[PDB]
Amino acid sequence: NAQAEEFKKYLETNGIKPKQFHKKELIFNQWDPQEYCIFLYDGITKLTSISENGTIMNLQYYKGAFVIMSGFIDTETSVGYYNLEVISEQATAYVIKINELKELLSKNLTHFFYVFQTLQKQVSYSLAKFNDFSINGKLGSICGQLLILTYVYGKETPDGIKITLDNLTMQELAVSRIISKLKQEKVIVYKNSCFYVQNLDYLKRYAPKLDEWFYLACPATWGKLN
C-alpha cells in the first residue's frame, strides 16, 4: 500500500510518531471528549460500542493500513461514541487530534484524497454487505467475512486456501449452526489447527456484492486467488 507508506512519511515528517498497542488495549474509548484520527498502520482492531446496561457490541473491524476517525473533520465534534480495541497481538497506529488532521490534510491534497477514499471504501463495503445480507441472510454475512479473510490472510496449499491468521485472532474475530453445516458441506476445513477454504466459489456465490467490492477496492489481492 504505497499510499499508506506515503501517508505515514507525511505524518512523521510533521512530527507525528508511531505508537504501539497490545491486545485488548484501547486506542480510544467512547467517553473521550477529544476527537481523533487514528492512522492504523499495522495490526487488527475492532470498533465496538457499550450500551447503557454494559453489553458490548462489536460493530466493525479494521486492519492497517486504514484511517478511523472519531470526529467530523470540519466541525470537530463526535461522529459517534465508540471504542477502538486492538485484537491482534500487536498494533502500530498514529494518533492525531482531529484539528491537526484538518490542518495536515488542508496543506496536502494527495493525502486528503487518500483519507477521502478510505471513507468511500467504508461506504461501499457497507452497501455490499447489506446487499449480500438482504439476499442471503446470515449465510451471506458469514460467507462475506470468510471471503474477506480468505482474500486477505489466504495462502494456497495442496490442502486448500489456508487462512494464515493466528488461531487466537481467529477466535477473537445460529452462527455455529451454519458454519458447522458449511464445513459439513466441505466449504471450509478446520484441519491442523487452522481453517482451510476449499470452495471459494461457494463463498463468492453467497456474497456476491462483497466479492465485487473486493475486486474493485483490492484488485491486486483479489487477483491472486482468482
Footprint of Na ion (CB under 5 A): 32, 70, 78
Residues 53, 51: Cα–Cα separation, whole Å: 6
Residue 163: name the closest of 133, 131, 188 by CA: 188
Our finding on whether 200 is near its own copies (CB under 8 A) is no
Q: Which does 109 bind (CB under 5 to 8 A by kind): its own copies, Na ion, none?
A: its own copies
Our finding on whether 113 is near its own copies (CB under 8 A) is yes
Residue span binding its own copies (CB under 8 A) among the ranges 50-58, 148-156, 183-191, 193-201: 50-58
Q: Which helix (H) or strand (E) holds 94?
A: strand 90-97
Q: Which does 32 bind (CB under 5 to 8 A by kind): Na ion, its own copies, none?
A: Na ion
The grid coordinates listed for 123 are 461506504
Q: Are the beta carbons of 36 and 99 closer than 8 angstroms? A: no
Sequence-distant (6+) residues with CB within 8 A of 17 are 94
| Residues engaged in binding its own copies (CB under 8 A) | 3, 47, 49, 51-52, 55, 57-60, 69, 72-75, 77-82, 102, 106, 109-110, 112-117, 119-124, 126-128, 130-131, 134-135, 208-209, 212-213, 216-217
